Design a protein around this ligand. Sequence first.
Ligand SMILES: CO[C@H]1C[C@@H]2CC[C@@H](C)[C@@](O)(O2)C(=O)C(=O)N2CCCC[C@H]2C(=O)O[C@H]([C@H](C)C[C@@H]2CC[C@@H](O)[C@H](OC)C2)CC(=O)[C@H](C)/C=C(\C)[C@@H](O)[C@@H](OC)C(=O)[C@H](C)C[C@H](C)/C=C/C=C/C=C/1C
Ligand SMILES: OC[C@H]1O[C@H](O[C@H]2[C@H](O)[C@@H](O)[C@@H](O)O[C@@H]2CO)[C@H](O)[C@@H](O)[C@@H]1O
Lengths: 93, 403, 75
Amino acid sequence: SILWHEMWHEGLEEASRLYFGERNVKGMFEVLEPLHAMMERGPQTLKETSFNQAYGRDLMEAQEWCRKYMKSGNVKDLLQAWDLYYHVFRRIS
Amino acid sequence: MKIEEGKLVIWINGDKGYNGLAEVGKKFEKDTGIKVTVEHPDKLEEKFPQVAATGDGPDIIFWAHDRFGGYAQSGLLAEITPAAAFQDKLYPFTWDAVRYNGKLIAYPIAVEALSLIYNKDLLPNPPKTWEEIPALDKELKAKGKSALMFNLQEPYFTWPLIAADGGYAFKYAAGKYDIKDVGVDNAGAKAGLTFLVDLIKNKHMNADTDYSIAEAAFNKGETAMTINGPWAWSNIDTSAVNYGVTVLPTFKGQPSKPFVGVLSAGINAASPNKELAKEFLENYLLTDEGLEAVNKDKPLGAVALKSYEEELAKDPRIAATMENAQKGEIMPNIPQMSAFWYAVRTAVINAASGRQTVDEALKDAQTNAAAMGVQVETISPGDGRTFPKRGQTCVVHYTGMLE
Amino acid sequence: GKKFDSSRDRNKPFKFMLGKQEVIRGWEEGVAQMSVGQRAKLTISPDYAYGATGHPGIIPPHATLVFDVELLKLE
Ligand SMILES: CO[C@H]1C[C@@H]2CC[C@@H](C)[C@@](O)(O2)C(=O)C(=O)N2CCCC[C@H]2C(=O)O[C@H]([C@H](C)C[C@@H]2CC[C@@H](O)[C@H](OC)C2)CC(=O)[C@H](C)/C=C(\C)[C@@H](O)[C@@H](OC)C(=O)[C@H](C)C[C@H](C)/C=C/C=C/C=C/1C
Ligand SMILES: OC[C@H]1O[C@H](O[C@H]2[C@H](O)[C@@H](O)[C@@H](O)O[C@@H]2CO)[C@H](O)[C@@H](O)[C@@H]1O
């Protein structure tokens, strides 16, 4: 009964607050990592499947930017991730 | 400890006499063994509140009294407690300039006012009006010279003209400043700034002229006139140019009203040497011999110390400065002076560069004069009746830049 | 000065909710006094921006920010 869009809405609401408000990049990845691994497992309900169709690629791309940031260390890649994260957040709100 | 104990660190603007102040510091060190260091960094009026916020500031700061109100409000200044006998040694009005919320926050050093400085050889009788300057420039262009060159970057120098016809920063009510009563877009200010822009249009002045450009021109005898404070005199003395200090030209039959600044020394609220700072300022700087040392380097203007002022007032240059000072008004020391000065700076620069019209520039400056945080510069107008409200979404395009 | 971010470089407009503490104080009050269609230049003091901490990698400490913003439409 607990939905994917509910969890992503709260997750981003928390991760953005941790990075932009607490300057905690490490703590941000702690809340984001499990949500991506959740998509990694795949959708099992109608709602989950519809969600994945809409935002799946965007969220997948966003994580690739986060990974790029870990290696490069350039906050530009991290911003590019948040551009994709913000796009899906506005749609689910 | 961020601030060193047993050492006095003093910040003063580089246009002032910092070497003379250092000679006073040497006398203090000679008598006490306390090292005094005089630094003159750029944009120190902006740097102080940055560093002093954490308590990493200098021991003493030197600026005109207008900044000090904002400093006092931020609690960056210690309340100075001079002895009643010492207070009587400085002119009472100078103490009023350094009082905020009924508490003294700084020591007044000297009273500054802009004056018309002219080459006596190029121009025996300087113009009594602004309006006759364009004709004089035109006449002087024939001899490969120019009439007037002054700093057009800082709004301290262009304020007399704006205030001449009745342009005011903040309206002075019942012994208190009303911050909601701005007069930067009034008819008087519009007229004054227009005449300034007119001069630049008709190629009487260049909009890209700064302090140093205008100083080089006059001191080399390329221009006939300049507008500058007492500090500049010592450069002109060595320039071998015969010069006089006189009252600023009138505009529309009204005297030019410059903002009057009192050079003031405040003690950092974070300084562990507050009692040492007090001793330096009271017993060393604010003395006949102390002020003279600073004066000999760069003239302070009309000093706050009564004894030494009675000597300086005999100098006609000082009398000329104090003539302009009377016609002008002593600056408010309210925190909004920061906002005001940057608002009038933008408007003057934009108008001179032709980026905006006089009416457009002063319209922006009107709402910016009390805007402490953010200041708006209109690039192109809107519908002027559709302002966003709390709860609504705003779709915008933007670009982020560092100054 | 140095451009650090632009929505025009993305081609996609930026949206935010006003008076909900979503953006810096410079925007919150600078945009609140802007009309629709207006393009304005917001000069934001550090105290209304990112302060002494700044934003590492993008924004240095005590950085005064300059924003060239056009308010397109309200939603
Ligand atoms: C690549 O572009 C980035 C933003 C970058 C960051 C770095 C700076 C140089 C900059 O380039 O923007 C920049 O130009 C800038 O300084 N901006 C952006 C344009 C508006 C003014 C300013 C600003 O306030 O940024 C903001 C600044 C950096 C941080 C906030 C300042 C105000 C303060 O109250 C907040 O504490 C809470 C933190 C970023 C934003 O405007 C975004 C939209 C909003 C937030 C993150 C928070 O409000 C958050 O609260 C948890 C939310 O409610 C959101 C909707 C939750 C969702 C999931 C997250 C979205 C994240 C989007 C990120 C985006 C598009
Ligand atoms: O230009 C605005 C500026 O004006 C005053 O600063 C004067 C100062 O009083 C003089 O002693 C001398 O240093 O020239 C300055 C102008 O460059 C205000 O005191 C200051 O707050 C303001 O920024």
